[PDB]
DNA sequence: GAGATCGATCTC
DNA sequence: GAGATCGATCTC
DNA sequence: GAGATCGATCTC
């Protein structure tokens, strides 16, 4: 199943202050749940930087198919953002501080997609 | 300038969790410890590290933060949240919460830079 | 420096 | 009272 | 600054 995502599903996730990021739905380390109601949220683990995890509203998740989605996700986030300042922030290229990990994260997500759900759960959790 | 800095001890409220003892910390991926959600000046967030469960970290609105003095604050925080949650923490969550309180109590007796050095183990994993 | 925003101070 | 404006502040 | 608006008038 009734829920849109389950643990192991690969998803683009959007957090304010980050570019759209390749993630995997994962159990929260403390609560051990992967979804909760605040509107529904899912817990995710960022690829490319293991210590980074977050609760994300369904509205900021998109099923991951490939890097080719990224440009359109940026544009759609900017289209929905109210202020010129947020629009301009959303349209900036990924910063040098983040690019190495974002690239690694895309590579990991593509490798994860080639594995079974239980395999990628074991490797990345 | 800012209300909090890295190393400050704070109670943090996340929906689905009891009020939790935390330390303001640099985000693993952005390296920043504060930011404005959606770039709006009224929406300042701080990044926090949960005591008692190293892998658990989160961005919290300043308004969902209370400076940590001691465990005795917990009941009033519960009461205030119930006004706007009162059943006791149980089970495994209680044990992790109790361990986080003991750590926060130890950290509260230390200087800012002393506790930042002594609690770097919470940044692992 | 560049871009955007927020606000005390003008013209009307 | 309402724009217009010249910033001064904030992020980058 | 500049229209509506109130007071004591001019002048009819």
Curated annotation (Swiss-Prot), chain B:
It is found in: Nucleus; Chromosome. Residues 6-70 form the PWWP domain. It comes from the Eukaryota. Coiled coil: none annotated. Widely expressed. Predominantly expressed in thymus and testis. Belongs to the class V-like SAM-binding methyltransferase superfamily. Histone-lysine methyltransferase family. SET2 subfamily. Histone methyltransferase which specifically dimethylates nucleosomal histone H3 at 'Lys-36' (H3K36me2). Also monomethylates nucleosomal histone H3 at 'Lys-36' (H3K36me) in vitro. Does not trimethylate nucleosomal histone H3 at 'Lys-36' (H3K36me3). However, specifically trimethylates histone H3 at 'Lys-36' (H3K36me3) at euchromatic regions in embryonic stem (ES) cells. By methylating histone H3 at 'Lys-36', involved in the regulation of gene transcription during various biological processes. It is linked to Rauch-Steindl syndrome: An autosomal dominant disorder characterized by poor pre- and postnatal growth, facial dysmorphism, and variable developmental delay with delayed motor and speech acquisition and impaired intellectual. Other features may include hypotonia and behavioral abnormalities. A chromosomal aberration involving NSD2 is a cause of multiple myeloma tumors. Translocation t(4;14)(p16.3;q32.3) with IgH. Interacts with HDAC1. Interacts (via PHD-type zinc fingers 1, 2 and 3) with SALL1. Interacts (via PHD-type 1, 2 and 3) with SALL4. Interacts with NANOG. Interacts with OGT. Interacts (via HMG box) with NKX2-5. This is Histone-lysine N-methyltransferase NSD2. It comes from Homo sapiens (Human).
């Amino acid at each position: 199943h009734l829920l849109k995502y389950n643990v192991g599903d690969l998803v683009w996730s959007k957090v304010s202050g980050y570019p759209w990021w390749p993630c995997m739905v994962s159990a929260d380390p403390l609560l051990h749940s992967y979804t909760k109601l605040k509107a529904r949220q899912y817990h995710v683990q960022f690829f490319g930087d293991a210590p980074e995890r977050a609760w994300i509203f369904e509205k900021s998740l998109v099923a991951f198919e490939g890097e080719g989605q990224f440009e359109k996700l940026c544009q759609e986030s900017a289209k929905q953002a109210p202020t010129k300042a947020e629009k301009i922030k959303l349209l900036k290229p990924i910063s040098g501080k983040l690019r190495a990990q974002w690239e690694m994260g895309i590579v990991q997500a593509e490798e994860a997609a080639s594995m079974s759900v239980e395999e990628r759960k074991a490797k990345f959790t």
